[PDB]
């Protein structure tokens, strides 16, 4: 019930919708075009329809949905591929057979006829349960067990519990009554993208995001449930860091979110993920897709879907965190999302602000980024998850002055700063140590000292060495290495060794594909301790260089050690080289 | 007394667009009347009636227009402007943006309902600030000091430790003591702060043990953008009640005033108002006045409201509309430099652009020393000459610094090294710091000093 | 002597001239886009309001 | 008496001003002099606190009467004026000792006061000075932050949806500001005796 009255491009006016609500999604026309309500002036409505509105007919029916832009969660959310508006691309392609996306597809987000193995908890048929209680878990696939949380805003004494067995989402797995009225819940939960997910308490982040790369792990650490920023526009560093996060990061799940980038780039990345495979610490070999969800919205996709992809991804990450899993979101291109928002604002004729973006761009970006953090779960049993966002930025020409870049730098705690100059100089990590920073180090210091009380001092010494590296750089630039003292020469040599041996990774090489934090800490110790032990001896710099010449080659070899031998064997080899270097440093003095 | 009336509940909502909710057939509306909107789902949110024309009403809802149905929502007209239930018992508690008690405590039992945006003080009855303040930081007190009733903000770009400086000032706040009941009660507005910053503020304030005399008006970035505009209003109204109507001096603090500017810009762009510079509303000067222009001392009452805002230059540019208008209104600046932060200085206060327009009255003979003004002027003026010498050395060479310029360069170096730097918890007294300030001024010869007379500092004696 | 002259010229160009020009470019960009573009939309918006 | 605040006071015939304004400042009276009857304007960008020159000029001018009509200025300046002008003093040729507050009036409204009153402030100030001039004195004023009475214009033009001319200001801004400033000048007044009073408009324009 409801018919269109005026169709001016994307904007659509439909009469006979007195009961419509603002921002309630609606189905327009026989083709089931999907659009969101904007203005409810009079008894009429106003809808902007995402897909092309060409060919609409006046008095074509309009069908309400009684729900805002929402995502159907539950089993089967992992692995698949979804559009910006939560449209399963893979199943759509299989059903329609052809390649093109049909104008008005109506495939449900998750297949409601597929069977999943279900088994309840030890709860009784007449017990009491509340919102967020974990009443069952499901083996969606191997090694990615899926907990079934009773939806929030639903509570009451237990009435029926489905016994363990094979079931589908259409089955009524749970039924309960709060008052005399009883409600039955299936395995599918719908939640609006704009509304965050209910939380019990925002904890303080207390565990680093071990990305497997030494430069990110030690120099500029990032904590679970913490924002991150990447100036990714070239050098494939964004692809490299995304692959590292998918394969080696501590997160139990990853939710890539791609909006408004080049279509072939998304093709390449979405073909790369299935090829990516990660080995289990127990020796098992798995596929990253078994723990990966992908929301990719290319440029050809409607602008509104491009704007909504980010919220869809963050809501998916929150739902994953609802069962205490550590999940990491990855916004492919926040700049593209901002451009989509700008296009939408221009469609709405909103008053332009700085550089043309709407005045709420900073506020909306902050609202999105504020959802990341380590959070206590809702409902029992007691557990705690985390959601960390590693959303990248694409400043125009590298000038960190655009409002998107400025707001992101103002909100994001940790900025890693990939540099194209290092990529030109053949640097695999490509992380510019001169601009990166980790504002969460003060909070992470508790764990840093618990693991090793000397590690934080080593990090401070390394930061001082990096700061003096540029000083020695202009010193050599203006007068040369001749004017450098023996201590200055030792400091410069140690800085160069740190840059070319530990601060840089080798990625492609099997020995340096993954850098454990143990190996990183031992390498940092074997570098800094040797640097000091050589420093206080100031001995002629040339004489020290000849004596330590074998040691300099040995330090490169210490980095060359594979993690195959296990963390202790590599640590002992690093320690043995460090002890030999220390023995040479003190005895020869 | 005039008989009471129950507020009319309407259901004639006949239009929603942006953040503005239209109504029709309103029987006797009132401008700026607070209306709480109950949606069809039953959830309730507040709102103000912006424009009143004929029998219509253009309401601006607070929690957002989402979920409002043109045939199921109900609007109730309370018939009174927004009022904050201020009370003396409100001390030592935490409140939301609109004032909801969030410390797991019972709501405020109001001693009196007071309307926000209170009327101005008759400037005939207005008085002048005449007492210094012991915040606990050296460089702010020694030069460009703060008077008990003076407004002055902190200019500090994003990422700088200005939040830590504000927390240290609030925890170490106190009178000169040259009393506890009338001692500094701190109203701590927090417009658009991060959750981590919010937890930091709560923990730091609870740790110093001065919860008994500090009120937090926290408003996170998650809260609605319009609700951030009323947070400074509520904070300043509570400050007005505490100071003028109860006596104790209030040291009002508002963090991230740029967030308030952004909230104003968003609200104005929502209603499509005439834009000033950088798309900001054309009345931003008046709004920043209604926020700032309340610090001062009233003649008949012993209270005093001291204002210490904290702005943030967006592009680290002083010419941005928010800091420019503030400097027009705020009677002085205390400036924080990113360049000094690059030198690893904990309190990165740059003194070259930092001046207190009321310092000429804070100084005198009742407090401080008789050489305060001249020493401050010299350490303010010779810094510029040292900077010029540094620039000349950069553009010519080390040989350009003559027997005079090299003295200015050494003065600048020692001034940035010893004088400005201070401990994270150092309560450096004025005289002990003024001795080192005199030493810095004496690095230059005691006769080349042009502005200062020799006798002024000669009255004071070393050791 | 020649190196001193060349270094003085290079340092002056790096410090004075370029850092003089770039603020000028930023101010010119702000004056055009920050004012003229904003006014054009506001003028047209007021015109559309008059038509409505 | 009574007089409309927008209609200028009638005169006999305006005439050229040829007496310098002894401000007591070296720069104001040496390099860039002002005449008793001319119009001045001090930009004083943000942070300069240009009102110090205003107060010094009011304190030490040779003008017989000063009308400090600061519009949109901070209240603390008005508190300073009210506190210091009585306690501050000046001497006259008769030899006696008297305060400057005996001849200074403030029509000032602060920035936190309602916006629409600012134009009324400016106009009342100029009319009061015109009356004191018709008395025959060499009265003068200085309107602090006249640029605030352009925000007052545009914050009304926006409500009326008038067509924005430049930066939001209406089209008649220059016309109205000229109609205000063009009321200064030495003039033989109406009626005998032959009073030849003047009036000076030392405005202040705060630019963004």
Curated annotation (Swiss-Prot), chain D:
Protein residues bound to ATP: 44-51
Highest rank taxon of the organism: Eukaryota
Family: Belongs to the ATPase alpha/beta chains family.
Function noted in UniProt: Catalytic subunit of the peripheral V1 complex of vacuolar ATPase. V-ATPase vacuolar ATPase is responsible for acidifying a variety of intracellular compartments in eukaryotic cells.
Subunit structure: V-ATPase is a heteromultimeric enzyme composed of a peripheral catalytic V1 complex (main components: subunits A, B, C, D, E, and F) attached to an integral membrane V0 proton pore complex (main component: the proteolipid protein).
Name the record gives this protein: V-type proton ATPase catalytic subunit A
Lineage: Eukaryota, Viridiplantae, Streptophyta, Embryophyta, Tracheophyta
């Amino acid at each position: 019930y409801g018919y269109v009255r005026k169709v001016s491009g994307p904007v659509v006016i439909a009469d006979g919708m007195n009961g419509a609500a603002m921002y309630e999604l609606v189905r327009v026309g026989h083709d089931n075009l999907i659009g969101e309500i904007i203005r409810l002036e009079g008894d009429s409505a106003t809808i902007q329809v995402y897909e092309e509105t060409a060919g609409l007919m006046v008095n074509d029916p309009v069908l309400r949905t009684h729900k805002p832009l929402s995502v159907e969660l539950g089993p089967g959310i992992l692995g698949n591929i979804f559009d910006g508006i939560q449209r399963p691309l893979k199943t759509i392609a299989i059903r329609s057979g052809d390649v093109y996306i049909p104008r008005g597809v109506s495939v449900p987000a998750l297949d409601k006829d597929t069977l999943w193995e279900f088994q309840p908890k030890k709860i009784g048929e007449g017990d009491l349960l509340t919102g967020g209680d974990l009443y069952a878990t499901v083996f969606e696939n191997s090694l990615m067990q899926h907990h079934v949380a009773l939806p929030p805003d639903a509570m009451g004494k237990v009435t029926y519990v489905a016994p363990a067995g094979q079931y589908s989402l259409k089955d009524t797995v749970l039924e309960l009554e709060f008052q005399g009225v009883k409600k039955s819940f299936t395995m599918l939960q719908a939640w609006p993208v704009r509304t965050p997910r209910p939380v019990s308490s925002k904890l303080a982040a207390d565990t680093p995001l071990l990305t497997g790369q030494r430069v990110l792990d030690a120099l500029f650490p990032s904590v679970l449930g913490g924002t991150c920023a990447i100036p990714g526009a070239f050098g494939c560093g964004k692809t490299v860091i995304s692959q590292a996060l998918s394969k080696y990061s501590n997160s139990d799940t990853v939710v890539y979110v791609g909006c408004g980038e080049r279509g072939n780039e998304m093709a390449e990345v979405l073909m790369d993920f299935p090829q990516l495979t990660m080995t289990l610490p127990d020796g098992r070999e798995e596929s990253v897709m078994k723990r990966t969800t992908l929301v990719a919205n290319t440029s050809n996709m409607p602008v509104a879907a491009r704007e909504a992809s980010i919220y869809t991804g963050i809501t998916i990450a929150e739902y994953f965190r609802d069962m205490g899993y550590n999940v990491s979101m990855m916004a492919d291109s926040t700049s593209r999302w901002a451009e989509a928002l700008r296009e939408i604002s221009g469609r709405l004729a909103e008053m332009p602000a700085d550089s043309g973006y709407p005045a709420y761009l900073a506020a909306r970006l902050a609202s999105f980024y504020e959802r990341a953090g380590k959070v206590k779960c809702l409902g029992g049993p007691e557990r705690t998850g985390s959601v960390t966002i590693v959303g990248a930025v694409s400043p125009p020409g590298g000038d960190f002055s655009d409002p998107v870049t400025s707001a992101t730098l103002s909100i994001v705690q940790v900025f890693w700063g990939l540099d194209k100059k290092l990529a030109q100089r053949k640097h695999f990590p490509s992380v510019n140590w001169l601009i990166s920073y980790s504002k969460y180090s003060t909070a992470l210091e508790s764990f840093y000292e618990q693991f090793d009380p000397d590690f934080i001092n080593i990090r401070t010494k390394a930061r001082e060495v990096l700061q003096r590296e540029d000083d020695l750089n202009e010193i050599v630039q203006l007068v040369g290495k001749d004017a450098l003292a023996e201590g200055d020469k030792i400091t410069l040599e140690t800085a160069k060794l740190l840059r070319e041996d530990y601060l840089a990774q080798n990625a492609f090489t099997p020995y340096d594909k993954f850098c454990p934090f143990y190996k990183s800490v031992w390498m940092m110790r074997n570098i800094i301790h040797f640097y000091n032990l050589a420093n206080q001896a100031v001995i002629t710099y040339t004489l020290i260089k000849h004596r330590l010449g074998d040691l300099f080659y040995r330090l490169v070899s210490q980095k060359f050690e594979d993690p195959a031998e296990g963390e202790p064997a590599l640590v002992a080899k690093f320690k043995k080289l460090h002890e030999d270097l220390t023995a040479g440093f003190r005895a020869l003095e | 007394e005039g008989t009471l009336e129950v507020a009319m509940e309407y259901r004639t909502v006949t239009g929603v667009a942006g953040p503005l909710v239209i109504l029709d057939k309103v029987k006797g509306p009132k401008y700026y009347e607070i209306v709480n909107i109950r949606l069809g789902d039953g959830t309730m949110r507040r709102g103000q009636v912006l424009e009143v024309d004929g029998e219509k009403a253009v309401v601006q809802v607070f929690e957002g227009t989402s979920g409002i149905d043109n045939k199921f929502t109900t609007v109730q007209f309370t018939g009174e402007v927004l009022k904050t239930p201020v009370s003396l018992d409100m001390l030592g508690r935490i409140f939301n943006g609109s004032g909801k008690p969030i410390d797991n405590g019972p709501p405020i039992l109001p001693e009196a309902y007071l309307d926000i945006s209170g009327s101005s003080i008759n400037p005939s009855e207005r008085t002048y600030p005449e007492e210094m303040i012991q915040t606990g930081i050296s460089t702010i007190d020694v030069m460009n000091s703060i008077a008990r009733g003076q407004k002055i903000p902190l200019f500090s770009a994003a990422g700088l430790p200005h939040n830590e400086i504000a927390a240290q000032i609030c925890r170490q706040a106190g009178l000169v003591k040259r009393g506890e009941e009338d001692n500094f009660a701190i109203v701590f507005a927090a417009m658009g702060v991060n959750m981590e910053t919010a937890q930091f503020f709560k923990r730091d304030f609870e740790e110093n043990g001065s919860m008994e005399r500090v009120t937090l008006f926290l408003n996170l970035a998650n809260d609605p953008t319009i609700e951030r505009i009323i947070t400074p209003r509520i904070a300043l109204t509570t400050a007005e009640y505490l100071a003028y109507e109860c006596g104790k001096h209030v040291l009002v603090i508002l963090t991230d005033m740029s967030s308030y500017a952004d909230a104003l810009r968003e609200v104005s762009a929502a209603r499509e108002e005439v834009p000033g510079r950088r798309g900001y509303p054309g009345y931003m000067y008046t709004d920043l006045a209604q926020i700032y222009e309340r610090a001062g001392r009233i003649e008949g009452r012993k209270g005093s409201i001291t204002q210490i805002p904290i702005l943030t230059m967006p592009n680290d540019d002083i010419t941005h509309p928010t800091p420019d208008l503030t400097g027009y209104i705020t009677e002085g600046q205390i400036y924080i430099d990113r360049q000094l932060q690059n030198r690893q200085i904990y309190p990165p206060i740059n003194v070259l652009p930092s001046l207190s327009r009321l310092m000429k009255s804070a100084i005198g003979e009742g407090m401080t020393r008789r050489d305060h003004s001249d020493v401050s002027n010299q350490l303010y003026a010779n810094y510029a000459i040292g900077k010029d010498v540094q620039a000349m050395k950069a553009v010519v060479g080390e040989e350009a610094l003559s027997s005079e310029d090299l003295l200015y360069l050494e003065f600048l170096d020692k001034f940035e090294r010893k004088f400005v730097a201070q401990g994270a918890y150092d309560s450096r007294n004025i005289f002990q710091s003024l001795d080192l300030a005199w030493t810095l001024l004496r690095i230059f010869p005691r006769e080349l000093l042009h502005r200062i007379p020799g006798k002024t500092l000669d009255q004071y004696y070393s050791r | 002597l020649t190196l001193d002259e060349a270094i003085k010229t290079t340092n002056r160009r790096v410090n004075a001239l370029e850092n003089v020009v770039k603020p000028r470019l930023e101010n010119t960009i702000t004056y055009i886009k920050g004012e003229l573009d904003e006014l054009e939309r506001e003028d047209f918006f007021r015109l559309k309001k008059i038509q409505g």
